[PDB]
Amino acid sequence: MKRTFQPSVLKRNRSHGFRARMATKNGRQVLARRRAKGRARLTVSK
Amino acid sequence: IREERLLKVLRAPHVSEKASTAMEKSNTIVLKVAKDATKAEIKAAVQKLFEVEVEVVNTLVVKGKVKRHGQRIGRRSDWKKAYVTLKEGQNLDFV
Amino acid sequence: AVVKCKPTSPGRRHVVKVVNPELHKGKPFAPLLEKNSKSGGRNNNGRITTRHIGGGHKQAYRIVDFKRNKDGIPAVVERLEYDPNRSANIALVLYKDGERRYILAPKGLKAGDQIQSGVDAAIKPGNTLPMRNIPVGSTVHNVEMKPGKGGQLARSAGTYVQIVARDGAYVTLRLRSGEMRKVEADCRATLGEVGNAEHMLRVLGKAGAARWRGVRPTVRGTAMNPVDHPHGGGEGRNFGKHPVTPWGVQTKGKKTRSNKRTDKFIVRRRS
RNA sequence: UGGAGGACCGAACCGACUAAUGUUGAAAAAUUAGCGGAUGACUUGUGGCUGGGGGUGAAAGGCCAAUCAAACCGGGAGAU
RNA sequence: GGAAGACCAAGGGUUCCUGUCCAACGUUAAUCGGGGCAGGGUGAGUCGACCCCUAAGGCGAGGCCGAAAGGCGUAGUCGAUGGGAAACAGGUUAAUAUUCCUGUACUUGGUGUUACUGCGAAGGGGGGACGGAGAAGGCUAUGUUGGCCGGGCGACGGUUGUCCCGGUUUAAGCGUGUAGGCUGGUUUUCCAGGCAAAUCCGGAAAAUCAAGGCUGAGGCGUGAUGACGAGGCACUACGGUGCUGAAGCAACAAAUGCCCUGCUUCCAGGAAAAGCCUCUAAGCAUCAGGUAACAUCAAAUCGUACCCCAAACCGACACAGGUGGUCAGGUAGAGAAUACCAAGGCGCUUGAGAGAACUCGGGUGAAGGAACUAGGCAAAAUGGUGCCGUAACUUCGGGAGAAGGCACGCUGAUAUGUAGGUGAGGUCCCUCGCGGAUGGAGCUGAAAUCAGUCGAAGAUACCAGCUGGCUGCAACUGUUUAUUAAAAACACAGCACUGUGCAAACACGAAAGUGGACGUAUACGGUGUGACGCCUGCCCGGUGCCGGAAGGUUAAUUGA
Ligand SMILES: [Mg+2]
Ligand SMILES: [Mg+2]
Ligand SMILES: [Mg+2]
Ligand SMILES: [Mg+2]
Ligand SMILES: [Mg+2]
Ligand SMILES: [Mg+2]
Ligand SMILES: [Mg+2]
Ligand SMILES: [Mg+2]
Ligand SMILES: [Mg+2]
Ligand SMILES: [Mg+2]
Ligand SMILES: [Mg+2]
Ligand SMILES: [Mg+2]
Ligand SMILES: [Mg+2]
Ligand SMILES: [Mg+2]
Ligand SMILES: [Mg+2]
Ligand SMILES: [Mg+2]
Ligand SMILES: [Mg+2]
Ligand SMILES: [Mg+2]
Ligand SMILES: [Mg+2]
Ligand SMILES: [Mg+2]
Ligand SMILES: [Mg+2]
Ligand SMILES: [Mg+2]
Ligand SMILES: [Mg+2]
Ligand SMILES: [Mg+2]
Ligand SMILES: [Mg+2]
Ligand SMILES: [Mg+2]
Ligand SMILES: [Mg+2]
Ligand SMILES: [Mg+2]
Ligand SMILES: [Mg+2]
Ligand SMILES: [Mg+2]
Ligand SMILES: [Mg+2]
Ligand SMILES: [Mg+2]
Ligand SMILES: [Mg+2]
Ligand SMILES: [Mg+2]
Ligand SMILES: [Mg+2]
Ligand SMILES: [Mg+2]
Ligand SMILES: [Mg+2]
Ligand SMILES: [Mg+2]
Ligand SMILES: [Mg+2]
Ligand SMILES: [Mg+2]
Ligand SMILES: [Mg+2]
Ligand SMILES: [Mg+2]
Ligand SMILES: [Mg+2]
Ligand SMILES: [Mg+2]
Ligand SMILES: [Mg+2]
Ligand SMILES: [Mg+2]
Ligand SMILES: [Mg+2]
Ligand SMILES: [Mg+2]
Ligand SMILES: [Mg+2]
Ligand SMILES: [Mg+2]
Ligand SMILES: [Mg+2]
Ligand SMILES: [Mg+2]
Ligand SMILES: [Mg+2]
Ligand SMILES: [Mg+2]
Ligand SMILES: [Mg+2]
Ligand SMILES: [Mg+2]
Ligand SMILES: [Mg+2]
Ligand SMILES: [Mg+2]
Ligand SMILES: [Mg+2]
Ligand SMILES: [Mg+2]
Ligand SMILES: [Mg+2]
Ligand SMILES: [Mg+2]
Ligand SMILES: [Mg+2]
Ligand SMILES: [Mg+2]
Ligand SMILES: [Mg+2]
Ligand SMILES: [Mg+2]
Ligand SMILES: [Mg+2]
Ligand SMILES: [Mg+2]
Ligand SMILES: [Mg+2]
Ligand SMILES: [Mg+2]
Ligand SMILES: [Mg+2]
Ligand SMILES: [Mg+2]
Ligand SMILES: [Mg+2]
Ligand SMILES: [Mg+2]
Ligand SMILES: [Mg+2]
Ligand SMILES: [Mg+2]
Ligand SMILES: [Mg+2]
Ligand SMILES: [Mg+2]
Ligand SMILES: [Mg+2]
Ligand SMILES: [Mg+2]
Ligand SMILES: [Mg+2]
Ligand SMILES: [Mg+2]
Ligand SMILES: [Mg+2]
Ligand SMILES: [Mg+2]
Ligand SMILES: [Mg+2]
Ligand SMILES: [Mg+2]
Ligand SMILES: [Mg+2]
Ligand SMILES: [Mg+2]
Ligand SMILES: [Mg+2]
Ligand SMILES: [Mg+2]
Ligand SMILES: [Mg+2]
Ligand SMILES: [Mg+2]
Ligand SMILES: [Mg+2]
Ligand SMILES: [Mg+2]
Ligand SMILES: [Mg+2]
Ligand SMILES: [Mg+2]
Ligand SMILES: [Mg+2]
């Protein structure tokens, strides 16, 4: 039936995109944790 | 425009059946150009370097394919293609 | 014209609608209009601070003049309009000099009526003036509580205030709620009453109607679970407690008025 | 003459009343045959808002990512 | 086949097209593929994004607030799902085309000339600019028949005829100004209301004229001696290439598309802002700048393949599920239901036999007809259109499609096709036209009645109510336990209590602030009851709430 993931790009990027993280203290802490674990990509970007 | 930029625009002739077709029938040549060059600069650069008259330059961007080498997934680089219209006037040849 | 409907469908049965034939059919006066957005009864935290609001038809804010401060310049009533923003009707009036303003439409008002505001104005309904110049005992609406602020009291349809006392700087009013309140005599008021007093007669007849008016359903507390309300579940139909608001404060008789500022003004409570 | 309605019959559309099949399914809630609304308290697209001692609830403790009488992830933590 | 077709948006990201290969992948083989490897493929001033403008909402200099982080918000600045300039037909690729080519156009800017000239904004005013329902008149897409043109006399009786098949296509633009809708016009004087200014808007006063302006589908003309065009003639690697090219009209029906953001009506009273038009302030005056015609240049960048009712998106799979917008052929039909077909796409990626029990999905049944069973569960039956007929009870609307019954095919006549619908030719009129009247050829075309005829059966299929009687509860339409409960639960219109005087109670926030509301006691919140009709009796001892301050009692504080 209608499942849980109905994808949208504009949605995806406003919610989790780079800039969206950088907006806030918490977000920059996420990006800190990721850079510390050494991910391939931090956020969802194209 | 500066000439120094110009000589950096045009990478290579594009060779294929479509290419040959337009070159023969419509009097048009096909170029791989630097990803960032524009219709202005390509008009300039052909008119300058091959010294022949350009009518108009149409362009497109080719997304490189995705390949596998030994299980590894690589991505062929993008690039820009330019259809370059010459007026019926000039005749450009292969010696 | 208050009229019942022939019941051609169960919904239509109890409907009483109030048809004022004198109202303007066709668009309002545009330069006097504003944009208005419905809030869903939600504050700047997006929470619902006031339940039971939302949906409703779209409305445009008519800019109504409550200060009536354009003075000593006659104005005549062009037409009566329906205001979705309030109970009462309104009037589109034309001051001699070429300005138009909306006002609250008082009783006895109809197209063609000369009115005016200022200290000097004649006493007839739809005229405004500071209240020390008003005959004691007279009936008025659109009353200010502070000089120059604009009207606040008795803006609803059919409402009005009776002026029962003049003493020094303070006139005493009998408010529509039945409560005697002092207001400084320098506050302008407007003669007569608010019209469309039959507003209160009209019956909706069907839930849908209330839902057009921007009113969403109301869940009886004692229907909910004990977690959601103090009134709480029970087995079948069970009450057991004294009635309270959802936040636990006692309702049905508890006085919640507390101000010590405004006290010196209030003579006596309504009863 | 006129064209009111949470009006009527009825497809798309919305829904889920019964029956059977399915129950290591074609499907982690469906199918087939019938059933209710279908100009409205309707339905649906795109975007936004409300965040867990909270939301939201035409109120079933329902709903918040197939997890809800207090979500999820990391920590206290090798809780006991 | 209102899709299992065609086109998009989303989402995917090369799956597109060619060659080549068959291990793995594909529920079997696979020489095939959406699999592997290599190559090719996406061409824009006018289609989108960008860009200009704002909605909700977000961020937010100063600012207010807050232990810190931070919260709120002003000027701003972002944010489309909305408003903002302009391109069409044909031809072409193995794969793009409104982009390439042929033709024919269009818009906005820059410079230039020339003629004329009061131009200037973040300010002013208009415009942009807005609901539901309804009605029906004008049309067009489109279709059917006829004329026309090309071909056909046909595997079997009959077919040179009232016979058969196929075609009968043509756009934006530009000129024209029609069915319709809206609105009096023009000139002069005054007024300061439009935050300052105004010659513009609004207001007042005369003067004068009756047609004036605005809007507008479609038609007609051009576009077009052009294109497309059944086919035929040449060559062909048999895949195609080249040449040539008939007719290309008329009547009728007709949208849910357009006129129409219109018109009529209702109440629940129906976005904002910029481009756009005009008024002027600071200003600048032979400069500048504006208006028109011709010339001239520019129009950047990004998306463009393919899939989108799905084997490519969301479901772990090539998954019987889920996904918004657009187009809408024929005969029958009220119809976008249904049945059969067209354009077009498919045969659902294991078959081959056999023809047991049993299970699934169906079809049929003697005699009986609920005797079954928790229960007529399921099945059967009803089923359409017109006409006739219809009860208790009723809130006078209903109940009611109550119930029940009758005709229903074909052929002929009334009429070689009627009533209607459309309306040619002609004649007359004209303020001469896309005009008016007359006019009735052609074309279309119900319904009925009478006479005949076939069958067991004519609403022959698909399609398409089971009905009636008594009673519980709930007034009613709605809403609900996504995934065992749709109800008698919830809501409900209404009723009552009570709170609240506006800096409202209340609610969210340590606070600022916000909602309540740009509302104001005919308002707003809370609780209960739940249409309508009849009514709502007793009790203040208990808990609660409201009023009272006399006494008795009592906290910090002060310290005899
Ligand atoms: Mg070009
Ligand atoms: Mg491009
Ligand atoms: Mg690379
Ligand atoms: Mg806000
Ligand atoms: Mg309320
Ligand atoms: Mg309101
Ligand atoms: Mg209520
Ligand atoms: Mg309950
Ligand atoms: Mg809760
Ligand atoms: Mg409690
Ligand atoms: Mg209960
Ligand atoms: Mg009980
Ligand atoms: Mg849905
Ligand atoms: Mg549901
Ligand atoms: Mg079904
Ligand atoms: Mg149905
Ligand atoms: Mg019904
Ligand atoms: Mg129905
Ligand atoms: Mg909506
Ligand atoms: Mg709900
Ligand atoms: Mg869940
Ligand atoms: Mg919790
Ligand atoms: Mg808890
Ligand atoms: Mg510990
Ligand atoms: Mg342990
Ligand atoms: Mg221990
Ligand atoms: Mg069908
Ligand atoms: Mg979507
Ligand atoms: Mg894409
Ligand atoms: Mg691949
Ligand atoms: Mg392929
Ligand atoms: Mg291949
Ligand atoms: Mg295999
Ligand atoms: Mg095999
Ligand atoms: Mg093999
Ligand atoms: Mg492949
Ligand atoms: Mg465009
Ligand atoms: Mg804003
Ligand atoms: Mg700051
Ligand atoms: Mg902020
Ligand atoms: Mg912006
Ligand atoms: Mg954007
Ligand atoms: Mg858009
Ligand atoms: Mg746009
Ligand atoms: Mg293609
Ligand atoms: Mg403006
Ligand atoms: Mg609009
Ligand atoms: Mg209207
Ligand atoms: Mg036609
Ligand atoms: Mg012949
Ligand atoms: Mg006209
Ligand atoms: Mg040909
Ligand atoms: Mg439609
Ligand atoms: Mg439509
Ligand atoms: Mg393309
Ligand atoms: Mg395409
Ligand atoms: Mg779909
Ligand atoms: Mg499809
Ligand atoms: Mg899939
Ligand atoms: Mg398959
Ligand atoms: Mg599928
Ligand atoms: Mg759907
Ligand atoms: Mg059809
Ligand atoms: Mg028909
Ligand atoms: Mg078929
Ligand atoms: Mg076929
Ligand atoms: Mg297909
Ligand atoms: Mg069987
Ligand atoms: Mg049977
Ligand atoms: Mg039998
Ligand atoms: Mg029998
Ligand atoms: Mg019997
Ligand atoms: Mg037995
Ligand atoms: Mg029995
Ligand atoms: Mg049954
Ligand atoms: Mg049956
Ligand atoms: Mg009955
Ligand atoms: Mg005949
Ligand atoms: Mg005939
Ligand atoms: Mg006739
Ligand atoms: Mg006639
Ligand atoms: Mg017989
Ligand atoms: Mg018979
Ligand atoms: Mg009983
Ligand atoms: Mg009910
Ligand atoms: Mg009752
Ligand atoms: Mg119901
Ligand atoms: Mg359930
Ligand atoms: Mg159920
Ligand atoms: Mg507080
Ligand atoms: Mg406060
Ligand atoms: Mg507000
Ligand atoms: Mg109240
Ligand atoms: Mg109840
Ligand atoms: Mg007591
Ligand atoms: Mg007592
Ligand atoms: Mg007390």
Author numbering:
A (entry chain d): 1 to 46
B (entry chain U): 2 to 96
C (entry chain C): 2 to 272
Task: Provide passages from the article that reported this PDB entry.
Co-translational protein targeting is initiated by the emergence of a hydrophobic N-terminal signal sequence (SS) from a translating ribosome (termed the ribosome–nascent chain complex, RNC). The SRP, consisting of a hairpin-shaped 4.5S RNA (SRP RNA) and Ffh protein (SRP54 homologue in eukaryotes), then binds the RNC78. The RNC–SRP complex is then recruited to the membrane by the SR (FtsY in bacteria), which is composed of an Ffh-homologous NG domain13 and a largely unstructured A domain that serves to anchor the SR on the membrane and the translocon. Using cryo-electron microscopy, we present structures of the co-translational-targeting pathway intermediates and a complex with Sec translocon at resolutions from 3.4 to 4.3 Å.
Our electron microscopy reconstructions reveal two states of the RNC–SRP complex. In one state, SRP RNA and the M domain of the Ffh are ordered, whereas in a second state, we additionally observe the NG domain bound to the RNC. These structures were refined to 3.8- and 4.3 Å resolution, respectively. The SRP forms three contacts with the ribosomal surface in the vicinity of the nascent polypeptide exit site, in agreement with low-resolution studies. The NG domain binds close to ribosomal protein uL29, positioning the G domain in close proximity to the tetraloop of the SRP RNA. The M domain is located in the vicinity of the tunnel exit, while the SRP RNA contacts the ribosomal protein bL32. The interaction areas of the NG domain with the RNC approach the mean resolution of the complex (4.3 Å) and are established through NG loops 1 and 2, which clamp the N-terminal helix of uL29 and contact the C-terminal tail of uL23. The interactions include highly conserved residues mediating both hydrophobic and electrostatic interactions in agreement with previous cross-linking and mutational experiments. Taken together, the interactions of the M and NG domain with the RNC and the positioning of the NG domain in close proximity to the SRP RNA tetraloop indicates that the NG domain is in a state that primes it for the SR binding. Notably, in the RNC–SRP complex, the hydrophobic pocket is less well ordered and only weak density for the SS is visible, together with a flexibly disposed fingerloop and GM linker.
